[PDB]
């Protein structure tokens, strides 16, 4: 009785032996669910979805449904979810498009609060928190240890790098570099995520170097190239953590928040 | 002798005996179809769709899981009256949307046309009238008695105040709050929203003539950038633009039909 | 009995497909629609109606004459990462309207292990009430309102659609929060707050008149507002000038004093 008799499971589904599936769930074709995962009642896994281990998915979540992209033409595309994620009521996680790489991917140890939307072709890393009503549009790439405040929306193709923090009710139109606190509509940069650094017990020398690099990037009238060069020469040798900020600038395709 | 000649309606769907469902309609597991519902040919309901009652759904629609379609409205004045929701053809209604029936205080009718996309968690309140070829992005809230035209786009997490008229080819930016009427062709954005010109880019990509586009830009300037009253702007558009750019009539309509005033 | 042209296509108060924990305590006339799930330690009072597809997770007390619509998740474990499976509760009073896709979460032991909602509230589609909120009576939450943890809401509050309220904020009685707002600080009684983030825009005059309040009462509240927000005065001095010049003739001004005294995040300005 781990799988409720009222769950409707496509004959193609592959479900690990200790998986719990609650009443009235629907599991579509080509779905795999790994060990220790628990679905509550009333979960829909649309199709073509790989779910890892020890996940927990709550009622009224729509997981692995076809994307909202109007270019979509029925092509085979996928959603992947890693391990130890919490996916709350009324989330919507959509599959990829052929125009990108036919894949939406979420990593491990993520919290997706009520009504989190992960659009087609997002790539999301580990240990992220998406608060209530957060919308992540198509092709957005999110790193690790990011917090996205409630009722925020992220423009398609943005890159949201590790340890960043997005304030409640933000409209993110540009890339958010590593460690950066970005907030508002439209969102701008507000400093380094200091509290998050000290909450992970980060050193005085690290935080100070990252504060200096922030200043060089956002407040010193320097171009991206000039800022990177000054970080490399003055900060990176003793603060290797500064590399994540260099990466953000070098990988930015929409420009960065200001 | 008695063969079907065609699985389509899942056996777990609970369908009111008064419901009329076209023979090729697909209805997924655990759907609820209330009384006085009609569903047209080629329509597909996924699992877990609730159609509350008194709802007419047209042809070739697709309604996704956890949509609440044709439920009683949230107006505290509503007292259980048997009002209606009408949906046209070829609409895509995504997960968690909510479309509510009308009130007797207006015309007992919420109506949406055809070829619309309602993205995840689109809310259409009682007494809304929505046209064709519109796009509502995620988490859009359209309040009571709002009238939306054709070819409109409403960006994510936006809300539209009761009674506003959002005319054809307009665009509402993401994370916006619309408090007044948005005229035809107008880009409105912000909280509270202001007007930011004509959607030139759309028009160009759509192959509208350079003359049409220039005429609408000029009409916009008269309405928004010239210090003219509504009536003075209208009269100048009629005399100088309307003769070569009949498309400018939609802007005249917007100003003449406005009841809340226009977003500026 | 028609033996010729009958349709022959067919009710119980509780649908056969509802799955109800045996520990549930359900009043005689309660209606529960198809496919509902009622978890352990749930009580539901007389006159209450659940539509189809309602989940009541557990450890929830629901009063009389409530109406809960499809896809509502009621009394589910909260989203606080601090929560570790402890016994915590949700209480709902009477005559509430809980619309589609609402989510109401139980408390945490870090507070008082209880989320509480009163009576005669309207929670429109996708209203989220986080762990440990306390909500009073006659409130209206418009579509897509997200109320974060430990928020205290009084009575007769209106929260506009697509708004958010930050954890620990106190939203006092008769206040009004505009559409698309983000509340970061406490909102005093009778105050109109609007914006992302929200700021104060005077007394909720229209709301008062709508409850039949006198012009003398209204003018007094406006004077008190002027003292708190516009008279270059400190919190303490404003309270004193209200106590000596307004509170005599306008006893309703006490709510505003309460707001200032009980504020822990500071007030919206």
Notes on the structure:
The structure is a homotrimer. The first copy, chain A, is an alpha/beta fold and 258 residues long. Chain A has two domains: 191 residues, Hexapeptide repeat proteins (UDP N-Acetylglucosamine Acyltransferase, domain 1, 3 Solenoid), CATH 2.160.10; 67 residues, Udp N-acetylglucosamine O-acyltransferase, C-terminal domain (Udp N-acetylglucosamine O-acyltransferase, Domain 2, Up-down Bundle). The first copy, chain A, contains four helices and 27 strands. The first copy, chain A, has a ten-stranded mixed β-sheet. A nine-stranded parallel β-sheet of chain A has the order 1-4-7-10-13-16-19-22-25, with no helix packed on it. In chain A, strands 2-5-8-11-14-17-20-23 form an eight-stranded parallel β-sheet, with no helix packed on it. Chain A starts with 7 loop residues before the first strand and ends in a 7-residue tail after the last helix. Chains B and C meet through loops of B and loops of C.
Task: Describe how the helices and strands are arranged.
Three copies of one chain form a homotrimer.
Chain A: E1 8-9, E2 14-15, E3 20-21, E4 26-27, E5 31-33, E6 38-39, E7 44-45, E8 49-51, E9 56-57, E10 62-65, E11 78-81, E12 86-87, E13 92-94, E14 103-106, E15 111-112, E16 117-118, E17 123-124, E18 129-130, E19 135-136, E20 141-142, E21 147-148, E22 153-154, E23 159-160, E24 165-166, E25 171-172, E26 180-183, E27 188-192, H1 194-199, H2 204-218, H3 224-234, H4 243-251
Parallel strand pairs in A: 1-4, 2-5, 3-6, 4-7, 5-8, 6-9, 7-10, 8-11, 9-12, 10-13, 11-14, 12-15, 13-16, 14-17, 15-18, 16-19, 17-20, 18-21, 19-22, 20-23, 21-24, 22-25, 24-26
Antiparallel strand pairs in A: 26-27
Helix pairs in contact in A: 2-3, 3-4
């Amino acid at each position: 009785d781990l799988i409720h008799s009222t769950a409707i499971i496509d004959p193609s589904a592959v479900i690990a032996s200790d998986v719990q599936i609650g009443p009235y769930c629907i599991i579509g074709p080509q779905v795999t669910i790994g060990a220790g995962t628990k679905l509550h009642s009333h979960v829909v896994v649309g199709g073509f979805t790989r779910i890892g281990q020890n996940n927990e998915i709550f009622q009224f979540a729509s997981v692995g449904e076809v994307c909202q992209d109007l270019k979509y033409k029925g092509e085979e595309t996928w959603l992947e979810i890693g391990n130890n994620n919490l996916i709350r009521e009324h989330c919507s996680l959509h599959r990829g498009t052929v125009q990108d790489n036919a894949l939406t991917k979420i990593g491990s140890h993520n919290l997706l609060m009520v009504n989190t939307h992960i659009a087609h072709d997002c790539i999301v890393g580990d240990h992220n928190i998406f608060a209530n009503n957060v919308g992540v549009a198509g092709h957005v790439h999110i790193g690790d240890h990011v917090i996205v405040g409630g009722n925020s929306g992220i423009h398609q193709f943005c890159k949201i790098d590790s340890y960043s923090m997005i304030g409640g009710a933000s409209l993110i139109l540009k890339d958010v570099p590593a460690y950066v606190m970005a907030s508002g509509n439209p969102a701008h940069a507000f400093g380094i995520n200091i509290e998050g650094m000290r909450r992970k017990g980060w050193s005085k020398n690290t935080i100070q170097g990252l504060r200096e690099a922030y200043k060089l990037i956002f407040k010193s009238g320097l171009t991206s190239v000039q800022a990177i060069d000054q970080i490399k020469s003055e900060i990176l040798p003793s603060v290797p953590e500064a590399q994540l900020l260099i990466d953000s600038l070098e990988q930015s395709e929409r420009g960065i928040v200001r």
